[PDB]
Amino acid sequence: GRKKIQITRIMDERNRQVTFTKRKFGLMKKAYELSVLCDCEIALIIFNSSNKLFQYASTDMDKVLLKYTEYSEPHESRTNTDILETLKRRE
Amino acid sequence: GRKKIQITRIMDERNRQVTFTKRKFGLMKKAYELSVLCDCEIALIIFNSSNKLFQYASTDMDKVLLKYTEYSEPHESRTNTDILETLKRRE
DNA sequence: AACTATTTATAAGA
DNA sequence: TCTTATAAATAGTT
């Protein structure tokens, strides 16, 4: 962008909403690209701060959800806290 | 990148695995930024071609998924063909 | 595992 | 609505 922005909650309401709309599309675009390039199944679920739902899925959301609730082996499980710690070690 | 790539399945198996590892992190990083910048809650399910699970959640995976199952209102739902057609018609 | 030359994303400007 | 300058991601290289 015209400026670097800190990764912290955008305080201006309108800018938070505009950013939300644009970055949500960019994330869904990158999910679509990852699913085609690497032949994977991806489901993305977003609740905004008003608890409105936005969903993406590379194919059938319900089958991916079902297969998720049946998984029993350990697996990569990241959250914001882990990601933030990963980025702190790289910068 | 050094070259543009078309969004089609990477057929060389080692390159597909490298691109997968790298772009999965970038996707999770962008999800972390979206959730922090815009104060939203995100769940991300990824199954690779060998049906192995990789997951990200901004805070609480199963909480977000459970909220999703109880959401009855009409909401935006995107698929790969939706996104590919949004991208194609941007010309 | 890193680097880097390019492409892609997007913060602001218009 | 729609560019544009700039930041970020990443494909191919080392």
UniProtKB/Swiss-Prot annotation, chains A, B:
It is found in: Nucleus. Residues 2-56 form the MADS-box domain. Binds DNA as a homo- or heterodimer. Dimerizes with MEF2D. Interacts with HDAC7. Interacts with PIAS1; the interaction enhances sumoylation. Interacts with HDAC4, HDAC9 and SLC2A4RG. Interacts (via the N-terminal) with MAPK7; the interaction results in the phosphorylation and transcriptional activity of MEF2A. Phosphorylated on these sites by MAPK14/p38alpha and MAPK11/p38beta, but not by MAPK13/p38delta nor by MAPK12/p38gamma. Has no effect on nuclear location nor on DNA binding. Sumoylated with SUMO1 and, to a lesser extent with SUMO2 and SUMO3. PIASx facilitates sumoylation in postsynaptic dendrites in the cerebellar cortex and promotes their morphogenesis. This is Myocyte-specific enhancer factor 2A. It is linked to Coronary artery disease, autosomal dominant, 1: A common heart disease characterized by reduced or absent blood flow in one or more of the arteries that encircle and supply the heart. Its most important complication is acute myocardial infarction. The chain holds residues 2 to 92 of 507 of the full protein. Belongs to the MEF2 family. Isoform MEF2 and isoform MEFA are expressed only in skeletal and cardiac muscle and in the brain. Isoform RSRFC4 and isoform RSRFC9 are expressed in all tissues examined. It comes from Homo sapiens. Transcriptional activator which binds specifically to the MEF2 element, 5'-YTA[AT](4)TAR-3', found in numerous muscle-specific genes. Also involved in the activation of numerous growth factor- and stress-induced genes. Mediates cellular functions not only in skeletal and cardiac muscle development, but also in neuronal differentiation and survival. Plays diverse roles in the control of cell growth, survival and apoptosis via p38 MAPK signaling in muscle-specific and/or growth factor-related transcription. The modification Phosphoserine is found at residue 58. The lineage of its organism: Eukaryota, Metazoa, Chordata, Craniata, Vertebrata.
